[PDB]
């Protein structure tokens, strides 16, 4: 039992017309959701008849469903190139030709390159002429290049943002006979029950904080968070500098894909050539932000079977529920009971978005809520208690490798100490760029 | 009538100072705003005298006003260039000079060019020498270039961010005599009425979510949202890579404008030259985010009365109102009545920021609030009901082209099925970069 | 006294264990925090005995503690380069060698330079040959370049984001015996007192708005806000395009530092060479966002003891408090008293992130809350009133240089006019890039 009640009243509702007005006297209880696992135990008494009725209302979960917005596919790409050098006055290497080369025109040096539907480009670099470089003509020679992209892996990744976060509070309700039911509530919503009604009257749940983020789906392999804003168009140095509208087009490096300017770099070396890319590896990004991840005590994880991502509040929930009881009002509420907590472990890293996981062993005799805090109240642990002994865990963020933090916890208001002690690893500054490519295939030596 | 009351009590208020303490007995009611169009119907009874009065409070709107922060003007620019190639040892084409050319040095080749206050730069590219390139000297020739920018349109765009979102809750109150009045409430605000007072005692409204955004003003042509962080300094590939401190500076491409480094590309071709830019077209950006736009159930629109932008809550409203009645208390509240709802149409795109529009026909016999949800509650619809038949719409976000979703709706709690069905279009990945410029005009 | 009460009730609470029940009758009040400085004055009456008790609850502060995530060090860097031009067939200037030069290979031209652990790179640029350029050989000459980075100042900056914002609400309570005490509340937290309990039963405080941001620490000289998303990897044109894992690595410009590609530009001039950078100056960014800073009525400032940054609500506080009194209930609450307010000054910028500071002179005869709004309610002022005459200030945001805004204010609901007037300065579009570097030191052949 939890002490969740905020107000208790009697209210008459009148079906105004249909010429014959009907009134219903309802007992009213304004209660707080409190936290996941918190349970209001309400003994009701008949307003009119001498009758009693015991009700239990439990906050089971608080979820925000991500309704997706813009979306694209991407993957790991690598350049492959063909090269050929012609001396001045040989082949296409005349007057303006080399300096005038366009991206979309394939050189005659590569007449075997047929019809392509792959991301590709063509280049011509002026190299040295004269006897010193194997030519009779002393004017600049021409290095012709043809380059296409290819998928390193045969898997792709879909990046998307979230436009809507649709709240759903779920409650478990125990009736007088002990029969259990669940209900779902949206913002400003009401459900009817056997004994009256329950309504989410004030809702303060949402994504709040100071960081923009986005998500990645790996088909059949889960989701990942990206701790950066969703890039709307392809930009060099960002996730999605190459992007497509389908998984298959990533794998084939189809030409319908978009890419930011100048992603392919060229190192002319007379008769040798290197074409390289220094692109963001989206799979490295995925492995870091791999779900579940917790940010501002929202835990983002894969939905039941749904797919798509939800944000779970596994601790405190900020919502007011209005309870109306047909012809019954509050007689008394059930008092909270004390719990015993022991420290189990602290695992993870410091100065990182993923944070650290602290685990507790919590022993009690009734359902309720453990609340804990450090001295200055910068850390806050909120975990469920039950009849028996269960292990509960939540994410915390620290900025120090050697953690030794004293907390004060209780389920019933009498605080006792508890020392959280652990060793966290550092995560050194990283780069997601990966070099790809190398020597070209020389066509005519 | 909407069912909004959460508590009812009597409270006494006493003055603590003065020649004498005065006491006031007041009935007190705590209600939820519920949603736009929701109306609380309260019948009051006298606490000491035997009297009744009927009172009605309606939530008319919930607005967040944008108070702007940093701002800048931008637009569409194209490059114009002059070119002149000199053989080595001719003109300025001496020793180090070509490879040492500064952006702010104008070549003697272009003396005919007047005094400028336009964004401009100067380049020198080494080119081939010898008889093959029209020169006796075999050393590199010098291609001298003078480039300036010009506005492509004679209009500009103003980009800004929002630092403050200030809440204004608007209520319609009907007194006992049927007299209607309007009040506006901000955070922790109270306003006195004929019959007591009403105060916004708890406010949970605000901009939330996982996206940062900014806005654009097109002078005389409304507003647009940008689904991206406001960039505070000029950056290539971003809105505002060229920016100014005024509209007139954009139109004249004034030299006071800032631009990110290396925005003009050069393709030297001996005696031909191309100077191009690949700039973000801000007008393409404006059109895609043109207001009104909905994000996380906030509808962004131009404020009423000329300018600034606003965020409207057109469905759910999360706010608590404390009502105080002088010498009166709650007798009873009005019950909600049922809605009939029919699905009209569903129009728009999927997997897009703008979303899709569901339209419904709602028939009722009193003012209230339609509430609808799909099977797993990932979709939620809140629209106002009235006496009679009205069309109500709201934005939803889907991720599939063929939508067929069953909803359960009600105004009074008696839920009935409603099937939303339709076809949404795809929005293929886009790029706002547009190529501009071309060949130089050749001087000799 | 402030009028903060929202509801009042009686509840009976029963303990279920022991295996006989004890029941306690309690009076209940639901009040709003209202604002910093708001004070609820309750006189209580006995539920069973006839007795009176006096109680005072005051909102002292509402804080959001930043728990940090990813962090990195950065600073100001400048390049220094050595150059030496060799004619073709002299030194290493053979065949392919110049066009094939790798970044981490040091030329023989600079053997006199010892080995460094500094960020550095090496280049080779082809230049003109023949008699025109000081060579007998007509083939291209080689300009060899060795560049290294160095810190411009002997100080560094630490950039970080905030993953968690942990709420602490602070109340000052005067109990039945006149004893004054302070208590702290987290989300969904409860505290037992001499007279019952107070719980933070609904919390709507948190960071909201349409902007992402991050923070910088200047060691021993405070903090600054950055009005932009935290960049998770080094990127050109962004804060942190060069970044390190320690302060000492910034000062020594250590090679362990990461940098975005292509940060050093090269201008080869046959026997002259310039190496430059166009880097974001982080100290200019720091100065612009130096704390305290206010965004969406949250004031960001350094914590006391200077451990982290904090977000203060200095005006409105959106929170509901459930008060429970053992064997007592609400008799009456103290009425609000009136304010007189005079406009002092208006100082700051328009169309700026920092905004402008409005200062007011407020006179009252009791603690309370001044509330003000302009004609259309787009501007909102909430300041604390006290016994006597005090200066109160807060940040507003305007978009015009000549401000003249008409407000209506009150503490007790009786609105009176107040004219806010002043001149604000413009902050013209800026660029934080600063050019650094210059000519190389030329080695004698
Ligand atoms: C309010 O303060 C009263 C004394 O404060 C005096 O301070 C002077 C600086 C000047 O402002 C005088 O006008 C003030 O009277 C004190 O007598 C009252 O008891 C105080 N009231 C409360 C409710 O604490
Ligand atoms: C290639 O590019 C040029 C200009 O860049 C364009 O005019 C032409 O239509 C393009 N297509 C082909 C097939 O050359
Ligand atoms: C931490 O404790 C939990 C709870 O017993 C356990 O499941 C987990 O394996 C522990 N982790 C480590 C690293 O010991
Ligand atoms: C609580 O758990 C204990 C197990 O030791 C059991 O004996 C008791 O009956 C349980 N009580 C309830 C109410 O389930
Ligand atoms: C060119 O720019 C430099 C600074 O980059 C400046 O010192 C110099 O005066 C400029 N040249 C002219 C001719 O103004
Ligand atoms: C959809 O219905 C709305 C409301 O009835 C109407 O305004 C609109 O024209 C309709 N649109 C389509 C595409 O049918
Ligand atoms: C509904 O509107 C009709 C007019 O169309 C009116 O006659 C009737 O009184 C209204 N009913 C209610 C309950 O307001
Ligand atoms: C340059 O880097 C390569 C690895 O790519 C390494 O093998 C080589 O030894 C490095 N050169 C020097 C001089 O250390
Ligand atoms: C404005 O008034 C405040 C309050 O007294 C004062 O601290 C500040 O110095 C004043 N500023 C100016 C610019 O006059």
Residue B299 · residue B312 · CB < 8 Å: yes
Q: Quick check: A79 and A437 in contact, CB under 8 A?
A: yes
Question: Around C30, how many Cα atoms within 13 Å sit in the side-chain half-sphere?
Answer: 34
C175 near C196, Cβ under 8 Å? no
Q: Is residue B4 within 8 Å of residue B34, measured between CB atoms?
A: yes
Q: Residue A187 and residue B206: Cα distance in Å, rounded?
A: 15
- Cα C23 to Cα A203: distance, rounded to the nearest angstrom: 32
Residues with Cβ within 8 Å of A189's Cβ and at least 6 positions away in sequence, in order, are A199, A200, B371, B373
Tokens representing B201 are 């005692």
For A33, the 3-state DSSP assignment is strand
Burial B49-71 (b: 16+ CB within 10 A, else e): eeeebebbbbbebbbbbbbbbbb
Q: Determine which helix (DSSP H) or strand (DSSP E) holds A81, and give its type and residue range.
A: strand A77-86
User: By alpha-carbon position, which residue is closest to atom 12 of ligand 9?
Assistant: C345
> With contact defined as beta carbons under 8 Å apart, do B46 and B16 qualify?
no
What's the CA gap between A135 and C167, in Å, rounded? Answer: 76
Helices (runs of H) and strands (runs of E) counted in chain B: 2, 31
Rounded CA-CA distance A318/B202 in Å is 13
Report the relative pairing of strands B441-442 and B77-86 from DSSP bridges.
parallel
User: Is the Cβ of C262 closer than 8 Å to some Cβ of chain B?
Assistant: no
Neighbouring CB atoms inside 10 A of B21's CB total: 12
Q: For chain C, say whether A270 makes contact (Cβ under 8 Å).
A: yes
Q: Per DSSP, what are the bridge partners of residue C30?
A: C7, C322
- Listed in order, strand segments (DSSP E) in A110-263 are 120-127, 141-151, 157-174, 180-185, 189-192, 196-203, 214-218, 222-226, 242-243, 258-259
CA A321 / ligand 4 centre spacing (Å): 28
Measured between alpha carbons, how far is residue A310 from residues A61, A65, A91, A299, B256 in Å? 11, 5, 61, 8, 48
Atom of ligand 1 nearest to the CA of C367: 23
Cβ A305 vs Cβ A155: under 8 Å: no
Q: Count of CB contacts below 8 A, A vs C?
A: 218
Q: Residue A288: enclosing H or E segment and its boundaries?
A: helix A282-288
Closest CA to B203 of B182, B215, B223, B186: B186
The rounded distance, in Å, linking the Cα atoms of B128 and A139 is 8
Residues whose CB falls within 8 Å of the CB of residue B384, separated by 6 or more in sequence, listed in order: B35, B36, B37, B38, B362, B367, B368, B369, B370, B390, B392
Tokens of C407: 């407000």
Alpha-carbon span B318 to B203, nearest angstrom:
7
Alpha-carbon torsion (B116, B118, B121, B122), positive or negative: negative
Measured CA to CA, the distance from residue B276 to residue B260 in angstroms comes to: 15
3-state secondary structure of B137: coil
Which residues is C255 bridged to in the sheet? none
Rounded CA separation B57/A417 (Å) = 50
End-to-end CA distance of chain A: 84
Strand B214-217 versus strand B157-174 pairing type: antiparallel
Number of neighbours of residue A426 by Cβ within 10 angstroms:
11
Q: By the 8 A CB rule, do C364 and C339 touch?
A: yes
In a 3-state reduction of DSSP, which class is residue B429? Answer: coil
From residue C191, give the alpha-carbon distance in Å to each of A368, C26, C142, C345. 16, 15, 77, 42
The resolution of the experimental structure, rounded to one decimal in Å, is 2.5
CA distance A419 to A375: 12
Residue B377 phi, psi (nearest 5): 70, 25
CA triplet B187, B189, B191: central angle to 5 degrees?
A: 145
In angstroms, rounded to a whole number, what is the distance separating the alpha carbons of residues C64 and A243?
Answer: 39
- Chains with 3+ CB–CB pairs under 8 A to B are A, C
Say if residue A246 is exposed, middle or buried (CB neighbours under 10 Å; 0-12, 13-18, 19+): middle
- Pocket perturbation via mutation, ligand 1, pick of C37, C338, C387 by most ligand atoms within 8 A of CB: C387
Ligand nearest to the CA of C107: 8
- The domain ranges of chain C are 1-68+161-212+292-334, 69-160+213-291, 335-426
- HSE-CB of C439 using CA atoms within 13 angstroms: 8
B33 SS3 class:
strand
Alpha-carbon span B115 to A25, nearest angstrom = 86
C113 in reach of chain B (CB within 8 A): no
Closest CA to A251 of A30, A50, A439, A74: A74
- For tokens 């106002």, what's the residue? B384
Do residues C62 and C321 touch, judged by C-beta distance below 8 A?
A: no
Give the Cα separation of C208 and C187 in Å (integer). Answer: 17
Q: Which residues contact C173 (CB under 8 A, 6 or more apart)?
A: C55, C56, C57, C58, C180, C181, C182, C183, C193, C198
How many whole angstroms from A386 Cα to the centroid of ligand 4? 10
Give the HSE-up count for residue C71: Cα atoms under 13 Å, Cβ half-sphere: 24
Question: Chain-centre distance of CA B142, in angstroms?
Answer: 50
Residue with the smallest CA separation from ligand 6 atom 6 is B359
User: Are A5 and C12 inside 8 Å of each other by CB?
Assistant: no
Mind telling me how many Å the CA of C33 is from chain A's nearest CA?
15
Chains that touch A (3 or more CB pairs under 8 A): B, C
Q: And the tokens for C202?
A: 């609904």
b/e map C389-409, b = 16+ CB within 10 Å: eeebebbbbbbeeebebebeb
| Closest protein CA for atom 1 of ligand 1 | C387
Dihedral sign for Cα A102, A103, A106, A109, please: positive
Nearest CA in chain C to B8: C7
Backbone angles phi and psi of A250, in degrees to 5: -75, -45
Which DSSP string corresponds to A113-129?
A: -----B-EEEEEEEE--
Closest C-alpha to ligand 9, atom 9: C345
Q: What are phi and psi of C248, to 5 degrees?
A: -70, -25
CATH of domain A335-426: 2.60.40.3770
Cα(B279)–Cα(B273) distance, integer angstroms: 19
Nearest to A439 by CA among A276, A278, A277, A274: A274
What gap in Å lies between CA A35 and CA A392, rounded to an integer? Answer: 14
The answer to whether the peptide bond before residue A364 is cis (omega within 30 degrees of 0) is no
Nearest ligand 3 atom, CA A345: 1
Nearest CA in chain A to C240: A429
Tokens of A399: 């900025």
Check if the beta carbon of residue A42 is closer than 8 Å to that of residue A57: yes
Q: How far apart are CA C298 and CA C389, in angstroms?
A: 25
Q: Which residues pair with A11 in a beta bridge?
A: A26
Residue A222 touches chain C, beta carbons under 8 Å: no
Is A158 an interface residue toward B (CB < 8 Å)? no
| Interatomic CA distance for residues A93 and A96, integer angstroms | 8
Q: Is the peptide bond before A203 cis (omega within 30 degrees of 0)?
A: no
Beta strand A180-185 with A157-174 is: antiparallel
Q: What was the structure determination method? A: X-ray
Q: Which of A136, A115, A125 is nearest to A84 (CA)?
A: A125
Structure tokens at B369: 């609030």
Say if residues C159 and C214 touch (Cβ distance below 8 Å). yes
Residue C287's region, left for phi above 0, alpha for psi from -120 to 50, else beta, is alpha
CA distance C183 to C220: 31
Alpha-carbon distance A108 to C226, whole Å? 53
Contact B321, B31 (CB under 8 A): yes
- Omega before residue A246 within 30° of 0, cis: no
**Spatial distance between the Cα atoms of B147 and B83, rounded to a whole number of angstroms:** 9
Chain breaks in chain B (C to N over 2.5 A) after: none
**Residue C19: CB atoms within 10 Å:** 5
């Amino acid at each position: 039992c939890s002490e969740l009640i905020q107000a208790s009243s009697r209210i008459t509702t009148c079906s105004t017309e249909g010429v014959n007005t009907k009134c219903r006297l309802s007992g009213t209880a304004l209660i707080r959701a409190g936290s996941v696992g918190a349970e209001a135990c309400l003994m009701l008494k008949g307003v009119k008849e001498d009758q009693t009725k015991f009700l239990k209302i439990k906050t089971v979960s608080s979820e925000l469903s991500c309704r997706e917005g813009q979306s694209y596919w991407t993957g790991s790409f690598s350049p492959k190139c063909l090269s050929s050098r012609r001396c001045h006055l040989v082949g296409e290497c005349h007057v303006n030709r080399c300096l005038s080369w366009r991206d979309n025109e394939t050189s005659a040096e590569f007449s075997f390159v047929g019809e392509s539907t792959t991301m590709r480009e063509n280049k011509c670099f002026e190299q040295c002429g004269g006897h010193g470089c194997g030519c009779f003509n002393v004017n600049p020679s021409c290095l012709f290049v043809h380059t296409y992209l290819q998928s390193v892996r045969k898997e792709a990744l879909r990046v998307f943002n979230c436009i809507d976060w649709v709240h759903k509070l779920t409650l478990e309700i125990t009736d007088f006979d002990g029969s259990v039911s669940t209900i779902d509530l949206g913002a400003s919503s009401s459900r009817f029950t056997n004994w009256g009604s329950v309504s989410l009257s004030l809702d303060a749940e949402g994504i709040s904080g100071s960081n923009s983020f986005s998500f990645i789906e790996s088909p059949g392999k889960g989701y990942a968070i990206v701790d950066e804003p969703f890039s709307e168009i392809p930009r060099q140095g960002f996730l999605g500098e190459i992007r497509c509208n389908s998984e298959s087009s990533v794998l084939s490096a189809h030409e319908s894909c978009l890419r930011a300017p100048n992603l392919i770099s060229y190192k002319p070396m007379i008769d040798q050539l290197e074409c390289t890319t220094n692109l963001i590896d989206p799979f490295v990004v995925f492995e870091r932000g791999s779900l579940p991840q917790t940010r501002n005590d929202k835990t983002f994880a894969a939905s039941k079977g749904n797919r798509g991502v939800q944000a779970f509040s596994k601790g405190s929930v900020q919502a007011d529920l209005t309870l109306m009881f047909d012809n019954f009002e509050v007689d008394f509420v059930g008092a909270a009971v004390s719990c015993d907590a022991a420290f189990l472990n602290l695992t993870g890293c410091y100065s990182c978005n993923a944070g650290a996981r602290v685990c507790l062993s919590i022993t009690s005799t009734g359902t309720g809520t453990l609340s804990a805090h450090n001295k200055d109240g910068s850390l806050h642990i909120v975990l469920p208690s039950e009849n028996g002994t269960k292990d509960q865990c939540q994410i915390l963020h620290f900025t120090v490798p050697e953690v030794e933090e004293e907390f004060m916890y209780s389920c019933d208001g009498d605080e006792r100490p508890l020392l959280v002690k652990g060793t966290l690893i550092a995560i050194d500054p990283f780069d997601d760029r990966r070099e790809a490519g190398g020597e070209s295939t020389v066509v005519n030596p």
